[PDB]
């Protein structure tokens, strides 16, 4: 019975998984890892292509997997609650995702396939590739060149147990599917214990928030959200599953991209940038990313502050000319925190324009691959397994990459591409002295390579359980 209103407006404290009220049925039929990350230290990603002419036994397998393993949002919350209260660790965590091709394999009518246009086109689609600035599909890792039908995600803190359970699951799975690709994701940490990505920066700091446990935690640590509200409405991440079987059956769209990071070359380019500007290497890093390695926002400081829990309580209102945090910095390109509402609004509707800007946000659930020692500097074979959720790929991930990160004239003319993820690489203007207007041009090179991926839908659990 959830209305338009209920989906467009998050409660003030978020959705309370212990007292869900009208969101109870939703949480029971929605898969986990969407509204709140599964939080497990290890994961396995199995990309599947179902075997020809085996539709009925495939459906039986999916059904059994949904009955036995898939974790709902309610189950995810209950497992976290039982762990905190009684030290009892829960079952493995599991998600199941379908591509558009997967829906076709399953003989679901076109009109019943999730409607998102990028999801239907697929990440190999030439128009999609062109719009993202992505490389040719022939450059992708072999696993991703196959037609992918589905993704199985299994996660757990105990790696050896995770491997055993995966090996059990795969016995029946292999009868009906080719496993065309596998990843074993993990969480990289720095010596302070912060979660980082391979270039050494704390990662996952700024997220749309939905669940009470997150909202309340973030509020107490971010000054009552007095500079930035991280809450987001449910309709920025959920969509009705057109084939769900409850009054409140929802899913979300997944973007999966394997992003290789050339750490050695990145560090060299960062040092060179620092030498050219005659600044500290750590500040050069902060100008590229928008934060110091520890998470300190460069809009707020020209030095790292080393807080283990970095602040998210800022906007760029004290930095309108972007002489502290440049317009090109990754954080400011991907989350303008109002820049588009000021700079690109001429009818004066700041509030409406800011709401629209905020509607482009993505909910990240990324993990690392490759080298697990963060002191090392891999050239290839290490990076980020980029996963994010949204209700509209065209308006969220694709928008963020194609309209914000890539273009040289966003948010203002001659900003240049995002030096971390913008394709193609180009020219940025860097402040010589933090907080002062004079800049110098430097072409920071793109040290991230797209190695493959796909768009999926996370269906409602009831859909999956009644497929056979």
Tell me the two tokens of residue 258: 């394997």
Residue 40 binds: one of ligand HEM, a copy of itself, none (C-beta under 5 to 8 A by kind): none
Nearer to a copy of itself, 113 or 202 (CB): 202
- Residue 204 assigned as binding residue: yes
H/E element holding 182? strand 177-186
Sole binder of ligand HEM in the list 292, 397, 442, 457 (CB under 6 A): 397
Nearer to a copy of itself, 91 or 351 (CB): 91
Residue carrying structure tokens 């062109």 = 130
Distance between CA atoms of residues 291 and 306, nearest Å: 11
- Is residue 212 within the footprint of a copy of itself (CB under 8 A)? yes
Nearer to ligand HEM, 134 or 241 (CB): 134
Nearer to a copy of itself, 2 or 307 (CB): 307
- Is residue 299 within the footprint of ligand HEM (CB under 6 A)? no
Nearer to a copy of itself, 69 or 186 (CB): 186
Sole binder of a copy of itself in the list 56, 126, 161, 441 (CB under 8 A): 161
3-class DSSP assignment, residue 167: helix
Backbone phi and psi for residue 106, each to the nearest 5 degrees, phi listed first: -75, 5
Contact segment (CB under 8 A) with a copy of itself among 110-118, 123-131, 305-313, 402-410 equals: 305-313
- Cβ 452 to a copy of itself, closest distance in Å? 10
- Is residue 386 within the footprint of ligand HEM (CB under 6 A)? yes
- Is residue 321 within the footprint of a copy of itself (CB under 8 A)? no
Residue 205 binds: one of ligand HEM, a copy of itself, none (C-beta under 5 to 8 A by kind): ligand HEM
Tell me the two tokens of residue 58: 């495939």
Sole binder of ligand HEM in the list 35, 152, 400, 461 (CB under 6 A): 400
- Is residue 105 within the footprint of ligand HEM (CB under 6 A)? no
Least Cα distance to 380 among 266, 270, 260 occurs for 260
Distance between CA atoms of residues 12 and 435, nearest Å: 36
Strand partners, 15: 211
Residue 47 binds: one of ligand HEM, a copy of itself, none (C-beta under 5 to 8 A by kind): none
Contact between 237 and 208 (Cβ < 8 Å): yes
- Cβ 224 to ligand HEM, closest distance in Å? 17
Tell me the two tokens of residue 354: 């800011």
Contact between 446 and 435 (Cβ < 8 Å): no
| CA angle at 123 for the pair 154 and 113, rounded to the nearest 5° | 75
Least Cα distance to 81 among 12, 144, 20 occurs for 20
Site for a copy of itself in 15-54 (CB under 8 A): 18, 42
Contact between 229 and 14 (Cβ < 8 Å): no
Sole binder of a copy of itself in the list 216, 265, 274, 343 (CB under 8 A): 216
Cβ partners under 8 Å of residue 90, min gap 6 = 75, 78, 79, 80, 82, 83
Residue 297 binds: one of a copy of itself, ligand HEM, none (C-beta under 5 to 8 A by kind): a copy of itself
- Is residue 271 within the footprint of a copy of itself (CB under 8 A)? no
Q: How far is CA 207 from CA 122, 210, 218, in A?
A: 26, 10, 10
Contact between 263 and 382 (Cβ < 8 Å): yes
First to last CA, the chain: 27
Contact between 289 and 331 (Cβ < 8 Å): yes
- Is residue 334 within the footprint of ligand HEM (CB under 6 A)? yes
Contact between 193 and 373 (Cβ < 8 Å): no
- Residue 364 assigned as binding residue: yes
| Peptide bond between residue 327 and the one before it cis (omega within 30 degrees of 0) | no
- Is residue 170 within the footprint of a copy of itself (CB under 8 A)? yes
- Residue 330 assigned as binding residue: yes
Strand partners, 42: 156, 186
- Is residue 74 within the footprint of ligand HEM (CB under 6 A)? no
Binding residues: 204-206, 330, 335, 337, 364, 386
Residue list, annotated binding site for heme b: 204-206, 330, 335, 337, 364, 386
Given the rule CB under 8 A, which residues bind a copy of itself?
18, 42, 84-85, 141-143, 158-161, 163-164, 167-168, 170-172, 174-175, 178-184, 186, 212-213, 216-217, 219-221, 223-224, 226, 282, 296-297, 300-301, 303-311, 313, 369-372, 381
Q: Which spans of this chain sit near ligand HEM (rule: CB under 6 A)? A: 197, 199, 201-206, 259, 261, 289, 291, 330-331, 334-335, 362, 383-384, 386, 397, 400-401, 405, 420-421, 448
């Amino acid at each position: 019975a959830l209305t338009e209103k209920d989906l467009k407006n998050l409660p003030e404290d978020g959705i309370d998984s212990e007292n869900p009220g009208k969101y109870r049925n939703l949480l029971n039929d929605l898969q986990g890892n969407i509204l709140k990350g599964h939080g497990r230290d290890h994961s396995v990603h199995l990309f599947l292509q179902f075997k020809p002419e085996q539709v009925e036994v495939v459906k039986q397998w999916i059904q059994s997997f949904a009955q036995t393993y898939i974790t709902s949002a309610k189950k995810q919350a209950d497992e976290a609650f039982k762990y905190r209260q009684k030290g009892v660790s829960g079952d493995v965590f599991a998600n199941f995702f379908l591509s558009r091709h997967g829906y076709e394999y399953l003989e679901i009518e076109p009109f019943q396939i999730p409607g998102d246009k990028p999801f239907r086109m697929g990440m190999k689609n030439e128009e999609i590739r062109s719009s993202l600035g992505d490389p040719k599909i022939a450059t992708w890792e072999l696993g991703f060149q196959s037609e992918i039908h589905a993704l199985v995600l299994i996660a757990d803190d105990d790696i050896v147990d995770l491997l055993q359970i995966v090996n059990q699951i795969t016995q029946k799975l292999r009868q009906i599917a080719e496993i065309v690709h596998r990843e074993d994701g993990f969480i990289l940490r720095n010596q302070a214990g912060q979660i980082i990505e391979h270039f050494g920066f704390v990662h996952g700091v700024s997220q749309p928030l939905f669940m009470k446990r997150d909202v309340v935690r973030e509020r107490v640590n971010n000054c009552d959200f007095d500079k930035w509200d991280p809450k987001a409405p449910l309709d920025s991440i959920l969509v009705e599953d057109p084939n769900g079987n409850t009054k409140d059956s929802y899913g979300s769209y997944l973007v999966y991209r394997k992003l290789e990071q050339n750490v050695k070359a990145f560090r060299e380019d960062q040092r060179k940038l620092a030498q050219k500007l005659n600044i500290q290497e750590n500040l050069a890093g902060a100008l590229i990313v928008g934060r110091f390695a520890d998470g300190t926002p460069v809009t707020l400081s020209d030095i790292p502050t080393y807080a283990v829990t970095p602040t998210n309580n800022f906007n760029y209102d004290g930095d309108l000319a972007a002489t502290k945090c440049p317009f090109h910095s990754h954080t400011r390109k991907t989350n303008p925190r109002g820049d588009t509402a000021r700079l690109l609004t001429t009818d004066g509707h700041f509030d409406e324009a800011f709401k629209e800007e905020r509607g482009h946000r993505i909910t990240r659930r990324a993990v690392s691959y490759g080298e697990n020692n963060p002191s090392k500097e891999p050239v290839s074979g290490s990076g980020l397994l980029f996963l994010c959720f949204q209700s509209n790929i065209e308006n969220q991930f694709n928008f963020m990459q194609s309209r914000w990160a890539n273009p040289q004239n966003f948010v203002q003319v001659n900003t240049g591409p995002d030096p971390l993820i913008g394709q193609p690489s180009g020219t940025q203007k860097w402040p010589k002295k933090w907080g002062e207007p004079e800049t110098e041009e430097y072409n920071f090179q793109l040290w991230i390579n797209m190695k493959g991926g796909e768009y999926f839908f996370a269906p409602s659990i009831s859909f999956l359980k009644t497929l056979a």
